Amino acid sequence: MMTNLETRLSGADPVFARELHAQLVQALGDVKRRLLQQYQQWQQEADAIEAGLNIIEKIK
Amino acid sequence: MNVQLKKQLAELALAGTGHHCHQEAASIADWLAQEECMAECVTLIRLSSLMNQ
């Protein structure tokens, strides 16, 4: 049921965890400045990234 | 963003469906849906979300 990811975010791999979080925000910044039609697509992507950031915290 | 990161978000979404994070998983699912190569991927996430709700 549980993934390998969940166990790497639960404290067993502190470095992995902050690298993943780091790039997820990196990416978020990319699409956010991209958003300054085709906005609903990027906005959809911004939601997805932010969503992942919400889970990583709810399961760390 | 890049495929490797995307797969990490999908796994993250799948993990989320098992932690009462259906809204987050849905947001991820619909974005991945934008791609054709992730069909089944979004399928499972959604099916996992449907079964855990």
Numbering used by the authors:
A (entry chain A): 1 to 36, 42 to 65
B (entry chain C): 1 to 53
Text taken from the publication that reported this structure:
Although the N-terminal 14 residues of AscE may not be required to complex with G and F, AscE itself is essential to keep AscG soluble, monomeric, stable and with a disordered region to interact with AscF.
Here, we report the crystal structure of the ordered AscG1–61 region in complex with AscE at 2.4 Å resolution. The helices α2 (residues 14–35) and α3 (residues 44–65) of AscE formed a pair of anti-parallel helices in the AscE-AscG1–61 complex with a topology similar to those in the crystal structure of apo AscE. In contrast, when in complex with AscG1–61, this region was induced to form a two-turn helix, α1 (residues 4–12), located in a perpendicular orientation to α2, similar to that which is observed by PscE in the PscE-PscF-PscG complex. Here, we showed that the structure of AscG1–61 in the AscE-AscG1–61 complex consisted of an anti-parallel three helices bundle, with topology similar to the first on-and-a-half of the N-terminal TPR of PscG/YscG in both PscE-PscF-PscG/YscE-YscF-YscG complexes. Leu5, Leu9 and Leu12 from helix αA, and Ile28 and Trp31 from helix αB of AscG1–61 were involved in forming the hydrophobic core with AscE. We identified that superposition of AscE-AscG1–61 had a rmsd of 1.1 Å with either PscE-PscF-PscG or YscE-YscF-YscG, suggesting that the orientation of AscE relative to AscG lies intermediate between PscE-PscF-PscG and YscE-YscF-YscG. Taking into consideration previous work in the field, we propose that AscE is required to keep the N-terminal region of AscG in a stable and ordered conformation, while the disordered C-terminal region of AscG will only be induced to fold upon interaction with the AscF substrate.
